[PDB]
Design a protein around this ligand. Structure first.
Ligand code: CLA
Ligand code: CLA
Ligand code: CLA
Ligand code: CLA
Ligand code: CLA
Ligand code: CLA
Ligand code: CLA
Ligand code: LHG
Ligand code: IHT
Ligand code: IHT
Ligand code: PQN
Ligand code: SF4
Lengths: 179, 78, 741, 74, 168, 42
């Protein structure tokens, strides 16, 4: 959480300059002064950061999963689902019903996510955006705490574009991430 | 039944030109501006805000769809 | 700024006030010294504007009342769906829609009323229904009682949600007047969200559920053999068999290659030859186009982001040399008075109901509804009546606004003020036009009656004599007949075959055929114009003279609803805007009765019938209308006397209920005349004598009995009059049509 | 059938007599207008004062009895 | 505040932890608009029904009365509906629930504790410490059995197999 | 039960509706079990 890497004074687009929205006070992490369209002036920065971290997590876990699926396939799946990779595997698991159960349980979790988001406006909750308290093995309770927030945001941003590229490469070539 | 051509450079050009025309026309015609910052542009486009961009692009898409469908109908685009 | 602001826990939910009738009103909270208090309680129950001066309180009450009404409507719908699931022959009707009469009500065998469980068909005996629910469900793609049970469950859940929402938004989180007074935001959201998304969702449902199921049903597949809607949703190949364009996907949609969807999104027109209703593939495209139109329309007004309009600016900008200030002040009037909004909305809703009746018969939208003649007649007349009542209510609430919420200070030299300032010209001209129309529309019938009774049949106004041809209507019909391919090039058939074309026949029975207009049609149309104009005269005269007149310069002080201003000035009976609504309701009854009679006779005589193997159609009455509908004797004999046989010979049959209701409605109609022809003094004196009789036995109520107020007597007379007349027509129509169809 | 229609006729006679007798006996006065004889036989009303006084005259009693007499003879 | 059960969800205002098994779980805020005592009575009635239902399922699978036909617990329902025993059980449950209505009204009036019917025939809850421990255990078992009975019934519907026979 | 709710049940229209529904049920059941009684049996 350095004021040179992130925070006030950093400008991604020099010809524009850092926006004047609440999101760019220098307190919000992952701040590179990047908001050409000025979306943070019209949507709550809390909502936007919650969405960004959800995207980061989901795309940071899908990319790792694509790599894992291409390297090692769990026993009993390479037969049940078939031998389709990536999105073909998604279709096969949908037929199996695996994806349906995944959707049901993820929706169960996202219901409580919806409650958490609503409590910002209904009951004025002070939760941090993207903060769920999931720190079982202690890393946030220490010196590398803000450095781990920046790493999370940066790796999620990397992973979103990486997974987009991987999916499109599979759609074109038909190969998995490792090619 | 009318003809609707498949996606092509002509369709893309019509859509893009419609969007640009509606953006400029929005700059000239939109009376009241919202209360907020502006997209980082100078000169005539110095009060261009997001909501105004979004509105101009929505009208540009309406106009582009209309023009594409009509030009396909009359056979000019296709 | 358009924002949400509510008051938390404004009213505590408690039964304390349930035991204090009249709590809402200061005059009534005291108690019932007389029986007039009992009637005042009900008369003022929902007049929130007379309970308090707080617009915030009135708006909150209205919001919660709307939630309660929605819960009631959802309960009604759930009941209809549950009855379709449990006490109906819907499956048999699906198997053979043209042979078994729809039925979803069964009576208990108590006093011999089990006779009403007639042999409707499909091994089922119950009460034949004429609401069209079976056709609605068939169009929706329902093919089981399980789906109807789930529909009933959804309706019940929505009713519970609505009642909870009403309670919550009155007692837990009541929005404020700033929230309520968002016309721009409230119209943007209604237009885009409510309407646009509703028709978009319905288009999706029709494309994914209704279209393939109805395709197979028309192809003759059994309802049990047809796959399930989720099967259609998830098997794009199965749907790609019926509509081969689903193999293309949504790429055509997002690339504007919309012609790829012509298989299930088509501008075809006409009627489905198998079902006799509109093409569901046409309805899907209709609703998709409507969704686009509404979502675009809902982006017109300014809410929070600068883009949009302000209705205040538009109205204030629209003014001309004949109107002075123009529409200035109307925005404030409409965001400060609920009664003005209610009047506008009621007028529009009633006119919409009338338009819906017309369009729903000439273009039967549901499968197998056109040949279900009882359903068509019942729906047409029902929606006509709803429209008339809504229009009269619009007049009533315009008068209420004029008396209560009209302020000359804020309305100076605007359109409202100028209308008031030249009201005499309007009413005089409307009076003259009403007299002229009455003469030249009814004196024509009288002339025909006199000539026919004198034997001068060549001097009548008939197609075989002096002719009054509706050339303009015939010209419009010709235009619409020739439009397909010429002025609507990409439409295969006419919008309605009523304009002209070929007969559509389902089950050897006419679904819709051209409707020819002649002298009788000219006469009846001009009589419709006469009745509408007189109704408008009454209502508009009352509304304009609600506040003051040459007779009573101070009438707003008397109020919107007062009996009179005394026997002075020659007599000032029924001078208020309430009594105008009373008389205009009488005249609306007249108008709608003539309209529905015209529909019944014309459709039974020139449209409906059975088509023989020759291709010739024999109608229910067989051309009676052209030569009989030109005389009042013709209407009395060939329509009333002739067609009342079914209802008067219904005893011992499943229509015996219709016969009994015929008689009871006659009874109530006559019973109304006791209140309408009479006055309060006679009944108060009779009550004095009866109270003497009671006192002679050392007992009498503490709540002194009183005769009904003058206004209440008029209201009771009108209510019984309307109930009796409409019930008579109800029994007559249903018995006749269910007997001959 | 004769029995029932005869009792209908009895109802009609009795109700016409009711209206006419009430009009005749209350013509001079009632609790509502205890000074009716001052106003006469066929005055219009006494106004909306005491809850409404429409058709408070013996002439109005006759006017209603004429509907009932037309009903009975019918 | 934040609920103990869900760190990222605010503790519901009505749920102050006084009641047994209160870990601050009420994401949808039923306690905000409805009486927590009435909700607790509903919870404990449901849980008691579910626990007795689980025990009934197991005991019916292992043993059935000599005078009743042997059958799966779920099929026993439809059988007894026609036989008439189900009618008797429903009638007597309704008879007890008539007094349950009076108990609920007293609970609303604040005379009774939700789920407290003063039913300790064997006097197992005389000492407080044990009573509170038992109340926590009761609510925990109630919730667990509410889940487990649904699991049993749905698994039987899927496999058409009693739970004991399925577990092998 | 709330005394106010009981008073609301005691209100005239509620009592009239309940009493007349009870009477209608009485007559209906009498006609259901002893139908077509045009006379007192003697
Ligand atoms: C978050 C995104 C995501 C999604 C949508 C999926 C989806 C899937 N994974 Mg998983 N996977 C993920 C993350 C994800 N994975 C991660 C983070 C890892 C690394 C720990 C893995 C490692 C992994 C392996 C090793 C395998 C799967 C496989 C599968 C399939 C069956 C489910 C399973 O085995 O578990 C399914 C298509 C199986 C597969 O590919 O079957 C052919 C399989 O063997 N996944
Ligand atoms: C994604 C869904 C999925 C599916 C359809 C299957 C299916 C199967 N697995 Mg399993 N398996 C899964 C996930 C899945 N597995 C995961 C995530 C792991 C890693 C922990 C395993 C690890 C695993 C092992 C170690 C084995 C199986 C085996 C099996 C078979 C017996 C059932 C079982 O043991 O479980 C069956 C074909 C057995 C097998 O090889 O059967 C062919 C076996 O020995 N599975
Ligand atoms: C250069 C570009 C271009 C071109 C070549 C075309 C060409 C065409 N457009 Mg158009 N269109 C364009 C741009 C273009 N469009 C744009 C920018 C838009 C977006 C706004 C549209 C939106 C649009 C729509 C929404 C539709 C078309 C349609 C059409 C085609 C048929 C129109 C016709 O003949 O109707 C002639 C029709 C009439 C003369 C009858 C009009 C009467 C209607 C039915 C009722 C209106 C009455 C009104 C309520 C009351 C009157 C006013 C009152 C105050 C007195 C035509 C080939 C139509 C089409 O494709 O049809 C198949 C169509 O539906 N266009
Ligand atoms: C709101 C509209 C509505 C209307 C007008 C009706 C009307 C009717 N329902 Mg009801 N019903 C409705 C909604 C409605 N229902 C809903 C929402 C449900 C679902 C719970 C039901 C479920 C239902 C059943 C289960 C039955 C009826 C029956 C009846 C009939 C006799 C009721 C009776 O005598 O009660 C008198 C009761 C008193 C306490 C008095 C009657 C035609 C009965 C019927 O038709 O039997 C042949 C019947 O058995 N209804
Ligand atoms: C209390 C009055 C009343 C009653 C008892 C009924 C009774 C009936 N109506 Mg309804 N109706 C009424 C008022 C009433 N209507 C009014 C005032 C209107 C004008 C808006 C309509 C418009 C209407 C239509 C268009 C249809 C019915 C139908 C029916 C029948 C089936 C019921 C049903 O579930 O339809 C369910 C209704 C539908 C499936 C069609 C809905 C389509 C409309 C256009 C939706 C509009 C919604 C929108 C939010 C309304 C506000 C518009 C405004 C902002 C401009 C039934 C006889 C249906 C029928 O005749 O079936 C054979 C039918 O199609 N009615
Ligand atoms: C809100 C309405 C709605 C909803 C929920 C859906 C839902 C769906 N549509 Mg879509 N669809 C809609 C309206 C809707 N559609 C409309 C109005 C059209 C006409 C333009 C289409 C035309 C359409 C096509 C052509 C296809 C879908 C398909 C789909 C599926 C993938 C997306 C999904 C079930 C795909 C599918 O699998 O259909 C079975 C598909 O190929 N839809
Ligand atoms: C959207 C619809 C709507 C709404 C919200 C309102 C709202 C209002 N109207 Mg109404 N009104 C409407 C439509 C509507 N009206 C229509 C369609 C008409 C034309 C008939 C009128 C005509 C009208 C007049 C003339 C007056 C009102 C008044 C009022 C106010 C008080 C009404 C009251 O206390 O009723 C409480 C409810 C009742 C008294 C019950 C009345 C029902 C009668 C007895 C008939 C019911 C018969 C029923 C269908 C069953 C028949 C079958 C039989 C076998 C039993 C209130 C603001 C009054 C006002 O503002 O005065 C200052 C007023 O004088 N309205
Ligand atoms: C609609 C028909 C309009 C008739 C012309 C009327 C016309 O269009 O006038 C329109 C004219 C335009 O007024 P301004 O331009 O001042 O107002 C523009 C407005 O938008 C601002 O208020 O307004 C008047 O002068 C109203 C006079 C009503 C005239 C009363 C006679 C007509 C009564 C209705 C009977 C019609 C039968 C016709 C057959
Ligand atoms: C599972 C499944 C499927 C699927 C699927 C999936 C999972 C699809 C996933 C698609 C994804 C993740 C797409 C990502 C695209 C990212 C882009 C274009 C980034 C652009 C960045 C730019 C332009 C940056 C610009 C700039 C920025 C901002 C910052 C730095 C400077 C610069 C880089 C210049 C299907 C569809 C195959 C169907 C199948 O039946 C089921
Ligand atoms: C139909 C019918 C019958 C019947 C019947 C009967 C009795 C049907 C009974 C059905 C029942 C009891 C269903 C229960 C479902 C429970 C669920 C889904 C719990 C989910 C809990 C979760 C996700 C907890 C999550 C947990 C939470 C929240 C917090 C802690 C962590 C976590 C683990 C995540 C018969 C048998 C009479 C037959 C007759 O023919 C008619
Ligand atoms: C008959 C009559 C009476 C006498 C009628 C009275 C007092 C009505 C009292 C009837 C009782 C109290 C109603 C209850 C009994 C009914 C059989 C039930 C139906 C009514 C409810 C649905 C409201 C008037 O007071 C009156 C006043 C002004 C103009 C015309 C008339 C008028 O015609
Ligand atoms: S009291 Fe009766 S009669 Fe006299 S004025 Fe008023 S309404 Fe006319």
């Amino acid at each position: 959480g350095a004021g040179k890497l992130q925070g006030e004074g950093v400008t991604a687009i020099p010809f524009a300059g850092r926006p004047k929205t609440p999101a760019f006070d220098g307190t919000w992490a992952g701040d590179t002064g990047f908001d050409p369209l000025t979306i943070s002036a019209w949507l709550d920065i809390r909502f936007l950061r919650e969405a960004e971290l959800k995207h980061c997590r989901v795309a940071m876990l899908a990319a790792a999963g694509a790599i894992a699926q291409d390297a090692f396939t769990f026993p009993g799946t390479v037969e049940t689902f078939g031998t389709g990779k990536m999105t073909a595997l998604h279709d096969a698991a949908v037929k199996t019903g695996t994806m349906g159960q995944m959707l049901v349980w993820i929706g169960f979790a996202e219901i409580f996510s919806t409650a958490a988001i609503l409590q910002w406006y209904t009951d004025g909750s002070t939760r941090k955006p993207g903060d769920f308290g999931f720190d079982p093995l202690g890393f946030s309770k220490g010196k590398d705490a803000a450095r781990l927030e920046l790493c999370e945001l940066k790796n999620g941003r990397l992973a979103m574009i990486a997974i987009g590229g991987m999916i499109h490469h599979y759609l074109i070539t038909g190969k998995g991430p490792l090619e | 039944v009318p003809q609707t051509a498949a996606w092509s450079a002509k369709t893309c050009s019509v859509m893009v030109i419609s969007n640009l025309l509606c953006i400029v026309a929005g700059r000239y015609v939109i009376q009241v501006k919202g209360s907020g910052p502006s997209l980082p542009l100078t000169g005539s486009f110095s009060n261009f805000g997001l909501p105004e961009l979004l509105a101009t692009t929505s009208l540009g898409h309406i106009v582009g769809s209309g023009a594409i469908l009509g030009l396909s109908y009359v056979g000019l685009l296709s | 700024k358009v924002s949400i602001t509510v008051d938390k826990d404004p009213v505590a939910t408690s039964f304390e006030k349930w035991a204090q009738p009249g709590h809402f009103s200061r005059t009534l909270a005291k108690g019932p010294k007389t029986t007039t208090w009992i009637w005042n309680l009900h008369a003022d129950a929902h007049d929130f504007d007379s309970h308090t001066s707080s617009l915030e309180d009135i708006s909150r009450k209205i919001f919660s009342a709307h939630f309660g009404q929605l819960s009631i409507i959802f309960l009604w719908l759930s009941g209809m769906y549950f009855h379709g699931a449990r006490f109906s022959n819907y499956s048999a009707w699906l198997s053979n829609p043209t042979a078994v009469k729809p039925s979803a009500q069964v009576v208990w065998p108590i006093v011999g009323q089990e006779v009403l469980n007639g042999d409707v068909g499909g091994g089922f005996q119950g009460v034949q229904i004429t609401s069209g629910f079976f056709q609605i469900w068939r169009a929706s793609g329902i093919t089981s009682e399980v789906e109807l049970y789930w529909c009933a469950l959804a309706g019940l859940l929505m009713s519970g949600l609505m009642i909870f929402a009403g309670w919550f938004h009155y007692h837990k989180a009541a929005p404020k007047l700033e929230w309520f007074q968002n016309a721009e935001s409230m119209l943007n959201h209604h237009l885009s969200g409510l309407l646009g998304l509703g028709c978009l969702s319905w288009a999706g449902h029709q494309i994914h559920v209704s279209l393939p199921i109805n395709k197979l049903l028309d192809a003759g597949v059994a309802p049990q053999e047809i796959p399930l809607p989720h099967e259609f949703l998830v098997n794009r190949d199965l749907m790609a068999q019926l509509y081969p364009s689903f193999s293309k996907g949504l790429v055509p949609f997002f690339t504007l290659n919309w012609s790829e969807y012509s298989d299930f999104l088509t501008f075809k027109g006409g009627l489905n030859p198998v079902t006799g209703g509109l093409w569901l593939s046409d309805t899907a495209h209709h609703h998709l186009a409507l969704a686009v139109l509404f979502i675009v329309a809902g982006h017109m007004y300014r809410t929070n982001w600068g883009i949009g309009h302000s209705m205040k600016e538009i109205l204030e900008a629209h003014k001309g040399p004949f109107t002075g200030e123009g529409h200035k002040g109307l925005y404030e009037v409409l965001i400060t008075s609920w009664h003005a909004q209610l009047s506008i909305n009621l007028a529009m809703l009633g006119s919409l109901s009338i338009i819906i009746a017309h369009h729903m018969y000439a273009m039967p939208p549901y499968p197998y509804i056109a040949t279900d003649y009882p359903t068509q007649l019942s729906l047409f007349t029902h929606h006509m009546w709803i429209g008339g009542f809504c229009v009269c209510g619009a007049a009533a609430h315009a008068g209420i606004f004029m008396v209560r919420d009209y302020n000359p200070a804020q309305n100076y030299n605007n359109l409202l003020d100028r209308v008031i300032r030249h009201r005499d010209a309007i009413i005089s001209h409307l009076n003259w036009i009403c007299i002229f129309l009455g003469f030249h529309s009814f004196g024509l019938y009288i002339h025909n009656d006199t000539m026919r009774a004198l034997g001068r049949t060549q001097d009548m106004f008939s197609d075989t004599a002096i002719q009054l041809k509706p050339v303009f209507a015939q010209w419009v019909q010709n235009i619409h007949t020739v439009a397909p391919g010429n002025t609507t090039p990409n439409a295969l058939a006419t919008a309605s075959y009523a304009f002209g074309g070929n007969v559509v026949s389902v089950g050897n029975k006419v679904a819709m055929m051209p409707i020819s207009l002649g002298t009788a049609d000219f006469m009846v149309h001009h009589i419709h114009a006469f009745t509408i104009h007189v109704t408008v005269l009454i209502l508009l005269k009352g509304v304009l003279f609600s506040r003051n007149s040459r007779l009573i310069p101070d009438k707003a002080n008397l109020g919107f609803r007062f009996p009179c201003d005394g026997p002075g000035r020659g007599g000032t009976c029924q001078s208020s805007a309430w009594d105008s609504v009373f008389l205009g309701l009488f005249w609306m009854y007249n108008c709608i009765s003539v309209v529905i009679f015209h529909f019944s006779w014309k459709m039974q005589s020139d449209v409906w019938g059975t088509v023989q193997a020759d291709n010739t159609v024999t109608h229910i009455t067989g051309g009676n209308f052209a030569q009989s509908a030109i005389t009042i004797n013709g209407w009395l004999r060939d329509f009333l006397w002739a067609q009342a046989s079914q209802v008067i010979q219904s005893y011992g049959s499943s229509l015996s209920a219709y016969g009994l209701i015929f008689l009871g409605a006659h009874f109530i109609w006559a019973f109304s005349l006791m209140f309408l022809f009479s006055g309060r003094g006679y009944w108060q004196e009779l009550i004095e004598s009866v109270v003497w009789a009671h006192n002679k036995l050392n007992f009498a109520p503490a709540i002194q009995p009183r005769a009904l107020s003058i206004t209440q007597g008029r209201a009771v007379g009108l209510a019984h009059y309307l109930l009796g007349g409409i019930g008579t027509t109800w029994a007559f129509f249903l018995a006749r049509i269910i007997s001959v169809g | 059938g004769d029995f029932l229609v005869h009792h209908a006729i009895a109802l009609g006679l009795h109700t016409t007599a009711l209206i006419l007798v009430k009009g005749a006996l209350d013509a001079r006065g009632s609790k509502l207008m205890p000074d009716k004889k001052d106003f006469g036989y066929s005055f219009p009303c006494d106004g909306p004062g005491r809850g409404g006084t429409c058709d408070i005259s013996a002439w109005d009693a006759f006017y209603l009895s004429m509907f009932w007499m037309l009903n009975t003879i019918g | 505040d934040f609920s103990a059960a869900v760190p990222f969800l605010k503790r519901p205002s009505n749920l102050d932890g006084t009641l047994a098994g209160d870990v601050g779980f009420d994401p949808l805020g039923f306690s905000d608009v409805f009486d927590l005592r009435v909700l607790r009575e509903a919870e404990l009635k449901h849980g008691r029904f579910a626990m007795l239902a689980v025990l009934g399922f197991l005991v019916q699978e292992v043993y059935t009365f000599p005078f009743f036909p042997k059958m799966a617990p779920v099929d026993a329902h439809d059988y007894f509906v026609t036989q008439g025993g189900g009618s008797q059980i429903i009638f007597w449950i309704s008879f007890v629930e008539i007094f349950g209505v009076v108990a609920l009204f007293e609970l609303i009036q604040g005379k009774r504790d939700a789920g407290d019917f003063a039913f300790d025939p064997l006097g197992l809850g005389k000492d407080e410490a044990t009573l509170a421990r038992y109340k926590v255990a009761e609510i925990k078992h109630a919730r667990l059995a509410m889940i487990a009975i649904g699991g049993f019934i749905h698994q039987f519907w899927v496999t058409k197999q009693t739970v004991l026979e399925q577990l092998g | 039960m709330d005394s106010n709710f009981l008073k609301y049940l005691s209100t005239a229209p509620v009592l009239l509706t309940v009493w007349l529904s009870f009477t209608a049920g009485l007559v209906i059941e009498a006609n259901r079990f002893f139908p077509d009684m045009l006379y007192f049996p003697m």
